[PDB]
Amino acid sequence: AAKDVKFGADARALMLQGVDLLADAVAVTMGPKGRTVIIEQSWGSPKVTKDGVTVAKSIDLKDKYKNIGAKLVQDVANNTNEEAGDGTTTATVLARSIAKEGFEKISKGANPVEIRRGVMLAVDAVIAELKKQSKPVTTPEEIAQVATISANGDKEIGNIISDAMKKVGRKGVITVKDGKTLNDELEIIEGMKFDRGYISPYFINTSKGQKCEFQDAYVLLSEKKISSIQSIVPALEIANAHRKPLVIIAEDVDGEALSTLVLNRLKVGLQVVAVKAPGFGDNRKNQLKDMAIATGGAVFGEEGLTLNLEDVQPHDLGKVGEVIVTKDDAMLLKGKGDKAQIEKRIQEIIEQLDVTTSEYEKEKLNERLAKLSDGVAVLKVGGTSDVEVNEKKDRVTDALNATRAAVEEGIVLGGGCALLRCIPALDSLTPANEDQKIGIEIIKRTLKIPAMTIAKNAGVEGSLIVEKIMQSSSEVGYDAMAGDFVNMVEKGIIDPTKVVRTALLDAAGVASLLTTAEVVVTEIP
Amino acid sequence: AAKDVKFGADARALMLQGVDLLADAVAVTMGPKGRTVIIEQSWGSPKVTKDGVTVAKSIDLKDKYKNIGAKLVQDVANNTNEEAGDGTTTATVLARSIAKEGFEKISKGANPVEIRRGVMLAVDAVIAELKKQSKPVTTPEEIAQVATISANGDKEIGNIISDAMKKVGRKGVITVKDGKTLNDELEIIEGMKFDRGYISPYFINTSKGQKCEFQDAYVLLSEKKISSIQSIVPALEIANAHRKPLVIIAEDVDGEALSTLVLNRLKVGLQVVAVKAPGFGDNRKNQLKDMAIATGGAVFGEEGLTLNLEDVQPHDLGKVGEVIVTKDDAMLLKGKGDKAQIEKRIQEIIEQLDVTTSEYEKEKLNERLAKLSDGVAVLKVGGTSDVEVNEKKDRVTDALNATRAAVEEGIVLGGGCALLRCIPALDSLTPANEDQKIGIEIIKRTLKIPAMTIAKNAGVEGSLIVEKIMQSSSEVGYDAMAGDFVNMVEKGIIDPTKVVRTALLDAAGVASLLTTAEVVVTEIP
Amino acid sequence: AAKDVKFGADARALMLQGVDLLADAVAVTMGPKGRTVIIEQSWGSPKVTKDGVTVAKSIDLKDKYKNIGAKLVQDVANNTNEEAGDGTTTATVLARSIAKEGFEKISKGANPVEIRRGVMLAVDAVIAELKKQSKPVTTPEEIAQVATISANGDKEIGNIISDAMKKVGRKGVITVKDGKTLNDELEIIEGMKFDRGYISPYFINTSKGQKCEFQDAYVLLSEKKISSIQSIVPALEIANAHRKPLVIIAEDVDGEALSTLVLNRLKVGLQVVAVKAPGFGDNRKNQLKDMAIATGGAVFGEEGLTLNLEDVQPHDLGKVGEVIVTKDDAMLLKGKGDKAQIEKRIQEIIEQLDVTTSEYEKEKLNERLAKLSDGVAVLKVGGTSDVEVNEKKDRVTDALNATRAAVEEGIVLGGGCALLRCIPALDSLTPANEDQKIGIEIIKRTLKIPAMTIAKNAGVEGSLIVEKIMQSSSEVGYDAMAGDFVNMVEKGIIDPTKVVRTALLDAAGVASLLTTAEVVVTEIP
Fold first, then answer.
1. Residue B188 in contact with residue B378, Cβ under 8 Å?
2. Partners of B335 in beta bridges
3. Cβ contacts (< 8 Å) between A454 and chain B: which residues?
4. Residues A40 and A125 grouped into a single domain
5. Which of A357, A387, A410 corresponds to the end of one domain?
6. What are the backbone dihedrals phi and psi of residue A444, each rounded to the nearest 5 degrees, phi first?
7. What distance in Å separates the CA atoms of residue C189 and residue A269, rounded to the nearest whole number?
8. Which of A67, A113, C138, C149 has its CB surrounded by the most CB atoms within 10 Å?
């Protein structure tokens, strides 16, 4: 495979020319006044959209170096911001602006590593300032306010969100479902969730949204890894006898099992899904034991009690009402089993919390406790018809992910004004040398970019708006919807702090990586 | 898949150059004096035609951006106006005119969003004026007048249309059939219709017209969705034993059932069709219960009474005389079952209407009531031979769809004069700024376009006609057929108001979407 | 499928340049002095010919627009004149001349629709004049004269033609056959003919002439359509047991039956042919009943008497001596069955004619009567050897079709002089405006075209001949064979009036359609 190689500024120029296409195509769709972008798909109608992540995930350039620039911006600013579809555009625009500004200085004689150090210093100072001028959200009234704000004034949606949240706590688990009724209602049910996603992207069922959904499946628990281990088909025997699905939880899946399952799901699509074990080490073992207690099954490891995957009985497996598994996330609903032995295990974990003393110990114990003592709250959204319910479910999920992101680290002024308020923090910072001072001036400039872009999307003169917002009060900002200055928190122009912080971090990281890369090696066409 | 990306005016120019080809190819065939368009099909004779929707659905450009412009105009102005073949051309021409006029101003410095706001304001004012200067149709005499007018003076066709309509009411159901006789006659028969179309476009039988027709089929009712559920073939067993067809009604069809049915219909074409459930939620369940009562079958859900798709008996399914299903529309004819239990269910729904009180409740109850208490009227058109009957059936369907569209929202002056009479309404409107004033001048101009185009198609000087019609009386207009001014309602130059309103709405929407699009991303060849 | 689109004069120019190639290639072979045209077929010798329809059906241009022009002229001037091979060339030449003349005026500022109206007025006046100056043929002496004239003086052929005609009447049925003898002789035999052609072009047997011939076949009668209905193979069982063929008459054939029959005829060629039902409605049913009475079979509809296609007995089907079926035409010969019940059915139809009173009723009754009471006359042509008989059969068919066309609407002066005599009728016509006057001058010119072309083919100066024929007597014309003026009816330069009328009608229609077409959309190569 013959390769081509370019060096220094010669390759950085091409990477930047590839970046500023994605940046321009995404910066259009920022803010509430975001315009539309026509994306031609081959067979059907050209898809119109106003959503930054779709535009970003779409484009793919022809030239090799431009494509690697675009892909470098994408696979971080997008892949690292899967929580909400709001921070990705900000990340890409900040990244392009930092990179383009720094390329000028390093082409005019500055030292790249010094600029990267200065930029990292500035970004640390700005994140520090953010963590100060933020304000938390810890009372159900404020929770209702922020929820309703995120749902665009829907008092009912914000109300039901706060009701679920204050019922299952801040660290609880929340899910949305379609209640087949006219009115939305909140329900709490038996279930448990852990943070291990699906292993096979071919497992995708109910494809839209990249999910994997199955009903009343059987549950398998295996401490021993089933990597390159056939004889999984004994379980499939009873899983075909009883048409109910089955789920398997192994230390890992590889070789025989992996290759057979991917292909048979591709061609038959049998109702089984594989997921990695949730915990680690002894905590993993005790977690699988708790899950077996909660599902009515048993671990399929040979240690202790004798049981193998070579044979299966209907009472050996576990049973639950529903299961949902997606990227990095998986959950189980309405588990079967010994309801009295579940309480016995709860008491066991209580006495464990009583006896153990270390931070890690009691932490993992609280995790295992909450994973069984507290149920999940399902939001049964409803409406007149599925054409309404399918859209309201998406709005509810958006508002839910917004408020969950807000409760973690508070909220700040929306509309990109937050970064504007953090500019005076750069004054106190002192550079070690003049290159590290240019590394501060760069952030000084690039912090005003999201506000300028939202203003320009609203059709208004950007710099005129940003200079006035800068000199104005600390609590007032620009509302692109109404086109005039307003008290943001009062009006509701807010956004979670985690989003701004993550966006700025990823932007700085990618821009550094892209302005210090010295050698680019690409295939030859 | 390498993509290409263009920005702003540079892409809008190409999209507009792609639009004005479809607009020119369709504007020719407008009015009664519409010319002809030679469409070469590959194998046979070049098809001559004077029908706007065929010309529109035909063309498909070479360049990518021109093609997306043409497709943007098509997939709305056509797909949204499937009711009658008259509004689509008007929609496309209005869209092109608005877009071309606005592109000039936004190339001369105006703000796109402001123009779109002004245009939306003007369109709202014009639709308001239409809803005023319209006049309803609510008496059988006026119904006969408008029917005969739509059928081009055929007193017999309009008479039979009004007879069917006043017999089954305004909201009744009407169908046309071939009576195998010399004289057309009206018949009312047992049946029911709901608004869920076919799921598989491969189901098309009696292909011309995109329909699906079957006789004396069996009826299946399944509240449980059969998505990715095999064992549908038990029913197919008895459906092959008795050569009579079968229809299935499920919450949904997917996976196993979908993939098997599409392919076996492609290669064998077995006499079964799948359709989505008609209602929603509890209303869906009660609707399926009423349909089972009306057909002699039973719901195949496991709840309550035990019954599965794994086994079928001839008396488990429903039975009807005929079934027709098309896009968004499906109906059943001459259902079997307990004629006494049908009356019992009718009394049940009557007492339900008595007890329940909410608007939604009594609305759905009236729907379920009328879906069983009132039969459908079938129009048995007849003639000397099928070469006449096949054409008369199409004329009758056209007149029927025209009068049904007229009874909903009244009628207005035909020949595009209606929009001309709505021009003085734009005087009272006031703009917030000068861009929103150009957004009014644009509609001021584009409202005169359909009349100008019909006049030009008649070979007459357009502006000369439109200025005289503007200054003339409110009730007089231009008759391109006779080539002179005439009292329209008196002569019969009319058209339903719904058509003009929908055409103007879709035109404004598409023109806005096309004059504000900022980024176009297309595949590379 | 990317398309290309041209507008107005720009596309009409290309269509006309495509037309004037077919027109020139066919105008050569007009008249008796028609020259020859070398048509290269790929494998064998280049086929020489002097026949206009073969030259026309042959050519097929390269460019798309030229090809659609040529195909537009072809698929009407040919497809509408399948009766005799004489009118097609005249139609194409008149069409080209009108179109080329009108393109000049519409390129010099005239209104196309006005010209089309004027041209239609002129053509109506000319057809009126023709219907006046024609003269009928209603006596056996005149029949013999016109027959002998059409057969180029063959007294024997004209004599036998008149003998058959005056024996079976003007509306009788006549067929030609090869008598295997030295002398031609006339025979009348049992049979019946109806006007429904073959359904499958793959049915072609005895391929030359596009016919379908079979001997002593079985006859099937099915009122119920066999569209998408298998189990036709029960009949094929006995149709293979007895090697005699079978014919089926269904309301329609589609799906299962169509797809199986086309392919098995392609690969096996079993001796069965399918034809559409002859009549319509109740008349269709009574016609099938009469045909069953006449053939010894029975209708295979389930109504009344029980009988299905699922089973067949040798006495259920009908039986006839011979059957011939071609495009739009099908006939049966020497039917079997109850010769006494046939007379009983005849008496039934007689009493029906007695009781019924409406025009349509007695008309259909006379049709059903004559279809059984009167036999067909077969012309057994003969000669020394098949090399002579095969050519004499074609000459006899030509003369027969000529005299049958003459008896319908009389005869006129041959050699294109008829249209010349109709020129003075255009004087009385008055135009509404000057464009409709150019629409008269165009026909004034184009009427002299066939005579000019025949003269030029004879090598003589055309205009010199046409001016002298114009000023000469009403009964004298030009004989290109002898090259001098002669009394046409006396010499025998005649042609049926139907041919001239149809040619002029089709020419005017195509020329209008081609000079008013505004948009041409063609595939891109």
1. yes
2. B320
3. none
4. yes
5. A410
6. -50, -45
7. 70
8. C149
Q: Which residue has the tokens 């911006």?
A: A73
Dihedral class, residue C406 (left if φ above 0, else alpha if ψ from -120 to 50, else beta) = alpha
Q: Is-contact B372 B192, C-beta < 8 A? A: yes
Burial of C313 by CB count in 10 Å (0-12 exposed, 13-18 middle, 19+ buried)?
A: exposed
Q: Which two tokens stand for residue C335?
A: 């039917």
Question: In this structure, are A335 and A455 located in the same domain?
Answer: no
**Alpha-carbon span B355 to B349, nearest angstrom:** 10
The type of residue at B511 is: A
Go through chain B and tell me how many residues it has. 525
Write down which residue in A322, A345, A372 finishes a domain.
A372
Same-domain status, C295 and C335: yes
Which residues of chain B does A39 touch, with a Cβ-Cβ cutoff of 8 Å? 521
Strand arrangement of the beta sheet that strand B3-7 belongs to = A47-49, A37-39, B519-523, B3-7
Residues of chain B contacting residue A55, judged by C-beta atoms under 8 Å apart: 519, 521
Smallest Cβ–Cβ distance between A40 and the set B281, B360, B521 belongs to B521
The tokens for B105 are: 């101003």
Both B286 and B329 in one domain: the answer is yes
Same domain, C249 and C337: yes
Token look-up 């509404």 returns C432
By Cβ distance, the residue of A269, A382, A459 closest to B113 is A459
Residue ranges of the binding site of A for ATP: 50, 86-90, 415, 495
Q: How far apart are CA A200 and CA A211, in angstroms?
A: 11
**Number of compact structural domains in chain A:** 3
Looking at the structure, tell me whether residues C223 and C365 fall in a common domain: yes
Domain that holds residue C124: 1-134+411-525
Specify the DSSP element, H or E, that contains A443. helix A434-446
Q: What is the DSSP letter of B411?
A: E
Using DSSP, state whether B54 is helix, strand or coil: helix
Does B65 share its domain with B100?
yes
Q: From CA C443, how far away is CA C71, in angstroms rounded?
A: 23
Which chain A residue's Cα is nearest to B79? A45
Residue A346 contacts residue A337 (beta carbons within 8 Å): no
Burial of A513 (0-12, 13-18, 19+ CB in 10 A): middle
B499, two tokens:
């058509």
Per the DSSP assignment, residues forming a β-bridge with C325 are C212, C330
- Residue A272 tokens read as 């089984």
Strand partners, C221: C249, C299
CB pairs under 8 A between B and C: 81
Cβ(C386)–Cβ(C179) below 8 Å: no
> Does residue C222 share a domain with residue C176?
no
Per-position DSSP letters for C97-136, written without gaps between them: HHHHHHHHHHHTT--HHHHHHHHHHHHHHHHHHHHHH-B-
Q: What is the resolution of this structure in A?
A: 3.5
Query: Are β-strands C211-215 and C318-326 bridged in parallel, bridged antiparallel, or unpaired?
Result: antiparallel
Query: Which of B42, B269, B459 minimises the CB distance to C111?
Result: B459
Q: How far apart are CA B431 and CA B122, in angstroms?
A: 10
Alpha helices in A134-221 (DSSP H): 140-150, 155-168
